[PDB]
């Protein structure tokens, strides 16, 4: 019956905006068991059209452009054609997290190890493209020192400082990291504090940690608390919940996800949207609940929300590692609400279902910036060429969609990838010889 006209959702049916599906990839073969921790293991790079993946035979790195293979009108999308060819990088150790700096020079890889416990390696992008290095190896390496509670559940690097990096593990702790020609700790908080995420701000001036507690905490990148955003009035004490993930989209605006507090699997996340006063407004902090805009299916997965902002497009895309689908939040015209969008059945972006039955779920997801080729769906039309949003599902398959927006205004966000030149390239430190 809809009923009560404050518990409802802002949604709308978005018709000038389409997900279409490009041909599916294969990365990486089936696992043989479903991926259950956190993870993280697609990453971009926008500056030289370079795509990472992480996965059981190591990591994947391509020319993004040769992971992208265009539907032609009628071929069948349940297809999957295999890998492209890439660069094949062994690892030691199985991956859970991949990032890049901001710079696009630095790739985080985070791995466990029994022996070792988690570890990050940090490679140079430059060793990537230099074809007089067969062995690409990192850099240098960071400990983390523990075991399960030194999963890397969070890691991000700052937008504006190529060198900073901000580290939330399993336990609870988090580390500020400055990564040059090595590695230094520039900051940290014992696992007390109790963090389960994190999110630069826009300029890369601070730090939002999402806390067990259910608050966001907003610090300097030497650490030092500057504001807390409230956990929302509507959760009760008899219900507590922790921030699963956070996204700092503007200075007073932050799309936060909360899940059980005790880490339950049932119940699924709610994604909420604060809008925040300024030291003027007078008015309280503001929060709209858009609770699941993904579906959450599957109830085996660690929840993770995988949200990224398209200021061009004044909107928030979302995945959920529960979920077979994407979804979008976007600010509506008054530009202080937001709404969620609906969009028509063949417009959407879901993952397909394993030749086994099952359905498959994110494991890593990125937009690709760089795509110059335009879209034909007829010998009558033939769109400008658009952004990608690509993911990695839980059976190694790579799932890419063209973003075509149409709502009025919307400029390009296509750009083509930059020349890497190898000077500067970083060597390990501790190398010896054999």
């Known amino acids: 019956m809809g009923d009560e006209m ?64 265009q539907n032609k009108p009628g071929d069948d999308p349940n297809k999957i054609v295999d890998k492209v060819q890439g660069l094949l990088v062994p690892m030691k150790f199985p991956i859970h997290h991949l990032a890049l700096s901001c710079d696009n020079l630095t790739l985080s890889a985070c791995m466990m190890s029994s022996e070792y416990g988690s570890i990050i390696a940090f ?31 969070d890691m991000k690097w700052n937008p504006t400082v190529p060198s900073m990096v901000a580290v939330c593990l399993a336990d609870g702790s988090i580390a500020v990291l400055q990564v040059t020609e090595t590695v230094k700790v520039c900051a940290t908080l014992p696992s007390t504090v109790a963090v389960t995420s994190v999110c630069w701000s826009p300029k890369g001036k601070q730090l939002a940690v999402g806390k067990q507690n259910g608050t966001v ?3 300097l990148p030497t650490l030092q608390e500057k504001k807390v955003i409230p956990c929302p009035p509507f959760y009760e004490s008899d219900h507590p919940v922790r921030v699963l993930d956070v996204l700092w989209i503007g200075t007073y605006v932050f799309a936060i996800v909360y899940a ?3 880490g339950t699997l049932e119940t699924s996340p709610d994604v909420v949207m604060a809008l925040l006063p300024k030291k003027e407004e007078k008015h309280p902090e503001i929060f709209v609940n858009f609770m699941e805009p993904c579906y959450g299916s599957c109830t085996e997965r660690q929840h993770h929300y995988y949200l990224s902002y398209i200021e061009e497009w004044d909107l928030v895309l979302a995945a959920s590692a529960a979920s077979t689908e994407v979804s979008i939040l976007a600010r509506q015209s008054d530009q202080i609400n937001w709404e969620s969008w609906l969009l028509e059945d063949s417009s959407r972006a879901e993952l397909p279902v394993t030749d086994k039955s099952d359905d498959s779920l994110p494991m ?4 690709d910036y760089t795509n110059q080729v335009e879209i034909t769906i007829s010998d009558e039309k033939t769109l400008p060429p658009a952004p990608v949003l690509m993911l990695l599902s839980t059976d190694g398959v790579l799932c890419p969609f063209y973003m075509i927006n149409q709502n009025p205004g919307v400029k390009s966000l296509i750009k083509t990838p930059e020349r890497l030149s190898l000077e500067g390239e970083r060597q390990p430190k501790s190398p010896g010889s054999t």
């Open 6 to 69: 404050d518990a409802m959702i802002p949604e709308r049916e978005m018709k000038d905006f389409q997900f279409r599906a490009l041909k599916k990839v294969r990365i990486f073969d089936s696992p043989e068991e479903l991926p259950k921790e956190r993870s993280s293991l697609l990453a971009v790079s926008n500056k030289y059209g370079l795509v990472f993946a992480g996965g059981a035979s190591g990591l994947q790195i391509f020319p993004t452009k040769n992971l992208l293979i």
């Open 123 to 153: 490679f140079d992008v430059r060793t990537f493209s230099n074809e007089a290095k067969q062995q690409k190896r990192p850099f240098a390496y960071h400990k983390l020192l523990k075991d399960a509670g030194g999963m890397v559940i």
């Open 217 to 219: 905490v907003q610090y």
């Open 260 to 262: 059980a507090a005790d």
């Open 364 to 367: 890593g997801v990125v937009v």
